[PDB]
């Protein structure tokens, strides 16, 4: 029944939407340990999110599916009878979900603890981490979007989905030939508007564009939005997350009662500080938890933040270069052969990181057997499934075959580089696959793989829903 599954595999793999495309394609049994098919499995090939695979198990080797996160205010001594302090510190420990309610309710602690003046300056302080906020070699013009916002240890998560750096902007037509309305979002008074967009007759043309351009923190609206249009929403990054992060705390802090009339901006705690009064403090979920907004959805950003995290823990150092070794560490005290791997990031985004097919399965593995195997697989996505929480980035593929509900996979896509790697659980064993493509002139081949997955599935004993 073995080489039906294998003419099968190579017949799908002929498709003209691989033209030019180097495939890395390994299925294997998880039980037996048995290689059911192999092609280009030694190649080395551009991961996009394949990569927080790799990730992800060095996050829960090394800082425990325990793990939490968090947040604290200081000042140099308690608050007294007049009621007032100097400068304020607002100091962020790498939680990847500290929203604006975290915030306000850290401000309401401020206030219950005694003070109603910070009569200095508000200072966000995010050097938990080193302020490298971008990789090396990201490309500048993809800066403005939420998968390439800036890494700090002190950042606003935005939504149920926890886009860190980030501020929602919506654009709103008002009569046509008025100007269009522009919301900043959380970055109001924050993010510069320089707002060019204009309201078109009714029924006419939308061609809105909206940007950060590069090395500023302006939001520029350009075009026309048709008079009768829905309001359009997009989340644009910010420059500097801490700095926002301490702007949305001032006014927290004015709404909680607590007036603040320094100015605000970035710093540490001074250090000729002896005894810090701590007037407030948070705690995120613990890492099995962050790990499915993270994996559903593929947030960059939580990666790249989980690496510096990583450098921390194995070298007190909140950096790419040390947790990206961190991440190599751990692999291979999992029992992961990395001669394979070249690792520039935590995420996927940058084009220096290479893996194998081979090196994929080998990780799923050893990834299967290992103590935090169910908080790792319930947080891959699971095809075919409605709810985004459930289904994540695979919620609208497969539907009605026979791989829906059953496979849970990673996905990552950009310019010329795609993947799918992931589990096949049935009674005819427990199926590890990695498909990498790259070098495809088309749209990504994910019907190809999408295809894979379903022949897969029903090798492994499964028949579509009806
Ligand atoms: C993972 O792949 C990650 N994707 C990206 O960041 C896309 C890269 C776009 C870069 C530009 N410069 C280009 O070259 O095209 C996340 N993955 C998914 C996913 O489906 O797995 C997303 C939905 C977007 S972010
Ligand atoms: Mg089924």
Not at 13 to 39: C, F, K, N
Not at 124 to 134: G, K
Not at 375 to 397: I, K
Request: glycine share 12%; hydrophobic share 40%; no cysteine.
């Amino acid at each position: 029944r073995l080489t039906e599954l294998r003419e099968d595999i190579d017949a799908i793999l002929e498709d003209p939407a691989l033209e030019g495309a180097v495939s890395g394609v390994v299925v294997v049994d998880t039980a037996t340990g048995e290689e059911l098919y192999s092609r280009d499995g030694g190649e080395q090939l551009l991961p996009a999110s394949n990569m927080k695979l790799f990730t992800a198990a060095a996050a829960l080797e090394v800082l425990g599916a325990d793990h939490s996160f968090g947040t604290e205010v200081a000042a140099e001594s308690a608050p007294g009878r007049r009621g007032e302090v100097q400068d304020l510190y607002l100091v962020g420990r790498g939680d990847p979900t500290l929203s604006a309610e975290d915030l306000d309710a850290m401000a309401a602690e401020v206030a219950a603890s005694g003070v109603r003046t910070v009569r200095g300056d508000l200072y966000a302080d995010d050097t938990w981490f080193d302020s490298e906020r971008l990789v090396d070699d990201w490309w500048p013009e993809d800066e403005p979007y939420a998968y390439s916002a800036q890494i700090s240890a002190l950042t606003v998560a935005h939504g149920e989905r926890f886009d860190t750096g980030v501020t929602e902007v919506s654009v709103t037509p008002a009569a046509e030939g008025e100007p269009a309305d522009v919301d900043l979002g959380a970055a109001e008074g924050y993010a510069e508007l320089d707002n060019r967009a204009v309201t078109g007759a009714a029924g006419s043309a939308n061609t809105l564009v909206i940007d950060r351009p590069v090395g500023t923190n302006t939001i520029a609206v350009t075009g026309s939005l048709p008079a009768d249009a829905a309001p359009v929403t997009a989340l644009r990054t910010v420059d500097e997350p801490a700095a926002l992060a301490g702007h949305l705390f001032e006014e927290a802090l004015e709404s909680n009662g607590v007036t603040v009339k320094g100015d605000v901006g970035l710093g540490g705690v001074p250090a000729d500080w002896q005894d810090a009064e701590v007037l407030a403090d948070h705690t995120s979920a613990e890492l099995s938890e962050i790990l499915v907004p993270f994996m559903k959805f593929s947030n960059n950003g939580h990666a790249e933040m989980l690496v510096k995290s990583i450098g921390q823990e194995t070298a007190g150092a909140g950096t790419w270069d040390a947790g990206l070794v961190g991440v190599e560490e751990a692999l291979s005290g999992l029992g992961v052969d990395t001669a394979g791997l070249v690792l520039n990031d935590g995420s996927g985004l940058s084009r220096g990181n290479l893996v194998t097919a081979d090196t994929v399965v080998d990780l799923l593995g050893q990834a299967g057997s290992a103590p935090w195997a169910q908080t790792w697989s319930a947080s891959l996505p699971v095809a075919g499934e409605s709810d985004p929480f459930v289904g994540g980035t695979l919620a609208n593929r497969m539907r009605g075959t026979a791989a829906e509900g059953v496979v849970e996979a990673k996905t990552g896509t950009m310019s010329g580089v795609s993947a799918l790697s992931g589990y096949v659980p049935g009674p005819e064993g427990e199926l590890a696959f990695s498909i990498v493509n790259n070098g495809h002139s088309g749209p990504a081949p994910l019907a190809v793989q999408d295809a894979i997955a379903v022949r897969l599935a029903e090798y492994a004993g499964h028949q579509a829903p009806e």
